[PDB]
Write a protein that binds this ligand. Structure first.
Ligand SMILES: O=C(O)/C(O)=C/C(=O)C1(Cc2ccc(Cl)cc2)CCN(Cc2ccccc2)CC1
Ligand SMILES: [Mn+2]
Ligand SMILES: [Mn+2]
Length: 179
């Protein structure tokens, strides 16, 4: 029973905590042991869902947070109906307005460093990328940031808040040097 674990269960809502536990268990992992990863997955969940909440009613299909199998089903539905190309790696969202898959990144390193790694690693010329840090920085594909500024602003705020709560508990350094 780490401090970190109990911190995550206080910090994130129960639905996010449960989706993340499920995601971890599905790819082999334990939330009680790998607790920095548990916090990171919760974070990435929250951001993805805050992000889908920007923009209008029907704008995004939400991929993250589903079962791996159902997530691919929906990806296939969107591919087979928009003509858009089937990505190699699961994305987080689909943008019905701009007609692209998006993968949201949350990082404890230089926005720059994480962007290149996902770009090379996604090896998917058409999927859009949008990174946020715990520092207020963001980088997006084609400098095209999808949402208006106040929706991204509140994500950035939320992340700095998570960073502070962690630090006030002396879990931040560990969290940062776990990535
Ligand atoms: O880190 C992310 O931002 C993220 O969206 C990760 C993922 O969805 C996973 C799939 C994935 C997505 C993108 C890339 Cl470059 C590599 C793997 C599956 C769950 N697990 C992690 C890899
Ligand atoms: Mn994802
Ligand atoms: Mn992502």
């Amino acid at each position: 029973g780490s401090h970190m674990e109990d911190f995550v269960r206080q910090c994130f809502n129960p639905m996010i905590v449960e989706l993340a536990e499920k995601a971890m268990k599905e790819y082999g992992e334990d939330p009680k042991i790998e607790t920095n990863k548990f916090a990171a997955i919760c974070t990435h969940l929250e951001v993805c869902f805050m992000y889908s909440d920007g923009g209008s009613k029907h704008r995004f299909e939400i991929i993250e947070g589903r079962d791996r199998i159902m997530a691919w089903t929906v990806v296939n539905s969107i591919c087979n109906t928009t003509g858009v190309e089937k990505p190699k790696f699961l994305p987080d969202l689909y943008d019905y307005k701009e007609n692209r898959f998006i993968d949201i990144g949350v990082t404890r390193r230089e926005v720059h460093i994480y962007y290149l790694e996902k770009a090379n690693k996604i090896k998917s010329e058409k999927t859009h990328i949008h990174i946020f840090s715990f520092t207020g920085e963001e980088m997006a594909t084609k400098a095209d940031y999808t949402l208006d500024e106040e929706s991204r602003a509140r994500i950035k705020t939320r992340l700095f808040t998570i960073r502070q709560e962690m630090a006030s508990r002396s879990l931040w350094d560990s969290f940062r040097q776990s990535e």
